[PDB]
Design a protein around this ligand. Structure first.
Ligand SMILES: CN(CCCCC(=O)O)c1ccc(/C=C/c2ccc([N+](=O)[O-])cc2)cc1
Lengths: 219, 219
C-alpha cells in the first residue's frame, strides 16, 4: 500500500498570509500513462470533504487561484497564496494512482487573530429540569481567542470542580474565534441547598476574569 | 446538479449486518464509479472499495474484503454497501463518493453515521434556557437550549426551524455514563427578544423525538 505522510498535522496562520502543506508518498505516483494521481481535499467543519486539487496541480471548478499544488517525485505541496476565512478546516492529500487509494493523516489549518475576551452568559436550570428532579447550570463563553481558556465555577463562594463538562466549538469562519460551553451538573437537592452561582472565564492570572452570576433566591 | 442522498444515521448491535444506501441523481448513474470511504472520529480517512455500476464489478481494499459488499440497483440509481461482523471499530461516518472518469470530477455524499453498540436508544430531555431574572440592559441578549441524556448520535438542533442562523453556537456533544449531552446558544439584539418568540427545535431520529421548546422569560 502507498503511505501518504502529511506535514504538519496542524498549521496556524494569520489572514492574508501564505500557507504551505506537504504530503510525501512511500512510492512513485506516476501512472502508466505518465500522469500523477495526487489529489488535495478540504473538509470544512460539519461538512464532508471536497476535492480542491487533482493531478498534482489542476484546480477543480470555481476553486480560487490562491490555491496551487506542486509535485516533485514523491514529494507534493499544496500552497495558499493568502489564507482567507473560508480556507479553515482539514486538508487531506489523496493518491489515486495505485490501489488501494490512500490518504494523508490530514492537516488542521487554524487562524491566528488578535486576542479576544469571551462573552459570558450564565443560565440557571430551567423550571422544567427542576420538575424532572435534575439541575444543570450552563455557561457560555462565546467568541473568544485563543482557544485556551479556563472556567471557574463557584457555589456560595467555594470553587467547584466536580461534575463540570466543557465543549469547544470549531473555529468560527466569520471571525476566527472559538466558543465554549461549560455545564455544571447537580442534584435538585444540592442546587436547592445553595444560592450564589458564579461562572468565571480567565485565560491567564494577569488578565481580569469575566464574571457572571445569579442568586437562586432573588429575581 | 449532482446530488447524493445517503441513508440516515443508525444504531446497530455488534455482530450484525448493515446495508447503507446512496441514491444518486443529476448525472447518468452508470457513468461514474461509486467509491465508498470511511472516516473515523471525524478525522482519519480510508477508502473501502469501488463499484462500476455499469457492470457491477467491484474492487475492494484488502482490509475490507469480506467485511464490505458493494452492490447497485440501476433501476433506482441507488448504490449499496453492506457491512457485516460489526464491532465498535465500525462506528464511523460512511461516505459514498462517485467519480466521473471522463471529466475527472469527484463528489462526496453527506455520509451515514453508524453507531455500533448494545446501548439502548434514549430520547433526550430538552430544556429552554432563558437569561437570568435580572435587568442588565446590555446591547445583546443570549439564549440557550440544553439537550441532555440521549443515545445514539446524532441530534439536529435548530433555532426557529433553521430560519435563525446568525449568532448560533451549537456545541459538540459529550458522553458521560452512556448518555450524550449537547447545548446551543443563540445571540440576538435586545430588540429581538423577548418581543419575538424564539424556539429551540430538536430532532433525535433514532427515538422519533421532535420537540419545540419556546424560550420564555423566567420567574
Ligand atoms: C476503475 N478505476 C480505474 C480505471 C482506469 C481507466 C478508466 O478510467 O477507465 C478507478 C479509477 C479511479 C477511481 C477513483 C478515483 C477517485 C476517488 C475519489 C477521489 N477524491 O478526491 O475523493 C479522487 C479520485 C476508482 C476506480
Amino acid at each position: 500500500d502507498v503511505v501518504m505522510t502529511q506535514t504538519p498535522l496542524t498549521l496556524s496562520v494569520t489572514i492574508g498570509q501564505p500557507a504551505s502543506i506537504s504530503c510525501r508518498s512511500s512510492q512513485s505516483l506516476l501512472y502508466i500513462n505518465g500522469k500523477t494521481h495526487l489529489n488535495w481535499l478540504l473538509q470544512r467543519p460539519g461538512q464532508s470533504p471536497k476535492r480542491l486539487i487533482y493531478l498534482v496541480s489542476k484546480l477543480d471548478s470555481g476553486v480560487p487561484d490562491r490555491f496551487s499544488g506542486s509535485g516533485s517525485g514523491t514529494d507534493f505541496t499544496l500552497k495558499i497564496s493568502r489564507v482567507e476565512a473560508e480556507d479553515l478546516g482539514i486538508y487531506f492529500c489523496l493518491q489515486s494512482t495505485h490501489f488501494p487509494l490512500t490518504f494523508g493523516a490530514g492537516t488542521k489549518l487554524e487562524l491566528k487573530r488578535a486576542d479576544a475576551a469571551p462573552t459570558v452568559s450564565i443560565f440557571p436550570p430551567s423550571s422544567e429540569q427542576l420538575t424532572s428532579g435534575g439541575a444543570s447550570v450552563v455557561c457560555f463563553l462565546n467568541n473568544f481567542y485563543p482557544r485556551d481558556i479556563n472556567v471557574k465555577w463557584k457555589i456560595d463562594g467555594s470553587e467547584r470542580q466536580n461534575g463540570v463538562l466543557n465543549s469547544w466549538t470549531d473555529q468560527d469562519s466569520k471571525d476566527s474565534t472559538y466558543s465554549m460551553s461549560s455545564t455544571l451538573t447537580l442534584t435538585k437537592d444540592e442546587y436547592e441547598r445553595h444560592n450564589s452561582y458564579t461562572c468565571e472565564a480567565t485565560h491567564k492570572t494577569s488578565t481580569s476574569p469575566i464574571v457572571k452570576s445569579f442568586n437562586r433566591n432573588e429575581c | 446538479q449532482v446530488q447524493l442522498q445517503q441513508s440516515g444515521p443508525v444504531l446497530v448491535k455488534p455482530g450484525t449486518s448493515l446495508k447503507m444506501s446512496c441514491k444518486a441523481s443529476g448525472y447518468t448513474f452508470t457513468a461514474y464509479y461509486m467509491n465508498w470511504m470511511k472516516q473515523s472520529h471525524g478525522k482519519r480517512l480510508e477508502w473501502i472499495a469501488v463499484i462500476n455500476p455499469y457492470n457491477g464489478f467491484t474492487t475492494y481494499n484488502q482490509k475490507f474484503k469480506g467485511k464490505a459488499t458493494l452492490t447497485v440497483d440501476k433501476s433506482s440509481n441507488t448504490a449499496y454497501m453492506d457491512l457485516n461482523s460489526l464491532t465498535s471499530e465500525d462506528s464511523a461516518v460512511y461516505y459514498c463518493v462517485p467519480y466521473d472518469y471522463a471529466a475527472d470530477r469527484v463528489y462526496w455524499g453527506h455520509g451515514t453515521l453508524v453507531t455500533v453498540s448494545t446501548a439502548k436508544t434514549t430520547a433526550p430531555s430538552v430544556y429552554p434556557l432563558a437569561p437570568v431574572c435580572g435587568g442588565t440592559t446590555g446591547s445583546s441578549v443570549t439564549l440557550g437550549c440544553l439537550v441532555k441524556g440521549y443515545f445514539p448520535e446524532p441530534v439536529t438542533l435548530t433555532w426557529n426551524s433553521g430560519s435563525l442562523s446568525s449568532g448560533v453556537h451549537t456545541f459538540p456533544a459529550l458522553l458521560q455514563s452512556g448518555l450524550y449531552t449537547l447545548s446551543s446558544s443563540v445571540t440576538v439584539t435586545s430588540n429581538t427578544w423577548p418581543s419575538q418568540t424564539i424556539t429551540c427545535n430538536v430532532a433525535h431520529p433514532a427515538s422519533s423525538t421532535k420537540v419545540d421548546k419556546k424560550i420564555e422569560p423566567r420567574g
